[PDB]
Design a protein around this ligand. Structure first.
Ligand SMILES: CC(C)(COP(=O)(O)OP(=O)(O)OC[C@H]1O[C@@H](n2cnc3c(N)ncnc32)[C@H](O)[C@@H]1OP(=O)(O)O)[C@@H](O)C(=O)NCCC(=O)NCCS
Ligand SMILES: CC(C)(COP(=O)(O)OP(=O)(O)OC[C@H]1O[C@@H](n2cnc3c(N)ncnc32)[C@H](O)[C@@H]1OP(=O)(O)O)[C@@H](O)C(=O)NCCC(=O)NCCS
Ligand SMILES: CC(C)(COP(=O)(O)OP(=O)(O)OC[C@H]1O[C@@H](n2cnc3c(N)ncnc32)[C@H](O)[C@@H]1OP(=O)(O)O)[C@@H](O)C(=O)NCCC(=O)NCCS
Ligand SMILES: [Cl-]
Ligand SMILES: [Cl-]
Ligand SMILES: [Cl-]
Ligand SMILES: [Cl-]
Ligand SMILES: [Cl-]
Ligand SMILES: [Cl-]
Lengths: 189, 189, 189
């Protein structure tokens, strides 16, 4: 297996010296740089850059600058995804985002883990834990979502939350660590 | 009522499709973008942009870039307001800031709420809760202030706090959620 | 003593009106601005700017933009220091960073304290508390480290932590406030 294949299979992989992955990160970083330095009202240029970054034809994916991601192609997006300023989709592990998702400012979706033991960590190895973000979700500002976490459809994550464990669907959850407070009634009004 | 009037009256409003509000946000974002790409030592240009953004003649309002706001004209500023890097004044609800206010880096003042029910939320409606920041306050870095919250004059908010409830005057408060720890003696030395 | 000498000796100092300190902050801010607007793949230019900012010849110090610091020369760096996006080394108090240190995105290392009493604070005085970051450490994203704090060698700080007190070596610590969870086995594999 290549290092990319290991990354995508939830195995330890050589994040810092694999030329392929280095080059893919450099690609994404230069696109993010361009995007971050494109006037917000330059709508068509921004859409072109976002589509290049994610290697897809987005449908109402609104990205407020600055934005960051590692690979771009490893973020799978639904339609109607609203991403406020200063978010980071750290996507060595796939980040899957459903439809109708409101992401507040200063949110980090972190898929990278390093070894605890410094001898192994210092060698640059990582293990990626995918994040799944359900459709019909809302994240307040200043939220961090940790590796391997799933947020169920219909749920709301309060500002400042550190989401260390999976959140069931149709739930309001807040805190560090983030805990469910109560259910949400999402029936048709 | 217009959607702007609803926004300012703490009613649900059409944040995503009202052309007036869309256009006002676009104005503020383009000014922020220019400010964020202006050399920090270009004093006069930065003052001009800040005054254009807030639609006021500021008196020692120091904004360290990057900075973000939604409307600009809905942030009411005293004198001697020091805003460190990467703050966001999300001002659909009025953000009122007193005199002599020290705001740390990476602070978010969030006035927006969305409906909890996804069917209503997906339609883009919001409800804004004003934030009032007393004079003579200090906020550490990485603070989030939530909708409708008031921070009393003379108070200090510890780094990393998530301010979910009003903070009395002359108080030190820390945490997620932010809680008063003790009183501050602000008597004249 | 000059105000710089007071700053470095953990005494109250005139942070806002001392011309030397003002000028040194301006130097660092203009370099950061240039760095933050340099294409990420412009390796040589970035290295030159980083080395000018820190006034040292760095050895595998990787800075992902945006980055911020106050003085730059008051950050003492080891080799193999990896700093992800949107960090701020607020370095009126010295920030000492060891070798083989992984710093996640949106981390703030804050050495500045202000007076609690607003009359003294409004005069602009500060007191700086150095931060020491041991070798062989890993910080998740969204971490704040407060003034005077030391993180021991071999330790890991979970994402979202607010590090208010010193962390012993070879420890895993998480939370707001950040608390040791358990020891890390760092034995040579
Ligand atoms: C999601 C949100 C609306 C939930 O707030 P709510 O619906 O009013 O929540 P509740 O009424 O159930 O919770 C009240 C209690 O939970 C606590 N709480 C609420 N939100 C909290 C949060 N984000 N973090 C920690 N505690 C929180 C309060 O301290 C309060 O405690 P109490 O028993 O002492 O009164 C809110 O947390 C939020 O994220 N608002 C910020 C909005 C924002 O980030 N802006 C928009 C960008 S997407
Ligand atoms: C506001 C601040 C100075 C208060 O600190 P302080 O006056 O020394 O606080 P106290 O001694 O009263 O509080 C001590 C206790 O509260 C806790 N505490 C203090 N600050 C805290 C914070 N920001 N978050 C959570 N807990 C905190 C400590 O863990 C400690 O626990 P202990 O009882 O086990 O000792 C500090 O929280 C702060 O924000 N420092 C960072 C400054 C900063 O962000 N830089 C400048 C940018 S504006
Ligand atoms: C450092 C880190 C790996 C520790 O996670 P871990 O090794 O699985 O640690 P543990 O097994 O001790 O954690 C399990 C428990 O701790 C809690 N916990 C874990 N990380 C936490 C955090 N950052 N904040 C608060 N609580 C946390 C969980 O809520 C869980 O509680 P439980 O008893 O109910 O199960 C992780 O916190 C982390 O920072 N991950 C994010 C990585 C990141 O930021 N990306 C890379 C950039 S540097
Ligand atoms: Cl938002
Ligand atoms: Cl491990
Ligand atoms: Cl500050
Ligand atoms: Cl609601
Ligand atoms: Cl990282
Ligand atoms: Cl004091």
């Amino acid at each position: 297996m290549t290092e990319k294949e290991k990354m995508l299979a939830e195995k330890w992989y050589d994040a810092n010296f694999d030329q392929y992955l280095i080059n893919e990160r450099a690609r994404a970083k230069d696109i993010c740089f361009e995007l971050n330095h494109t006037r917000p009202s330059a709508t068509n240029k921004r859409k072109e850059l976002i589509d290049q970054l994610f290697q897809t034809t987005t449908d109402n994916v609104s990205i407020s600058i600055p934005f960051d991601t590692d690979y771009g192609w490893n973020v799978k997006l639904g339609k109607n995804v609203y991403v406020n300023t200063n978010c980071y989709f750290m996507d060595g592990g796939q980040i899957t985002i459903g439809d109708n998702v409101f992401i507040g400012p200063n949110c980090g979706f972190y898929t990278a883990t390093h070894p605890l033991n410094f001898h192994h960590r210092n060698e640059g190895f990582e293990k990626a834990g995918p994040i799944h973000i359900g459709s019909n979700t809302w994240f307040g500002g200043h939220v961090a979502v940790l590796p391997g976490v799933t947020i169920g459809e219909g749920s709301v994550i309060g500002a400042g939350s550190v989401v260390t464990k999976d959140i069931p669907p149709h739930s309001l959850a807040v805190g560090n660590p983030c805990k469910v407070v109560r259910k949400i009634d999402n029936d048709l009004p």
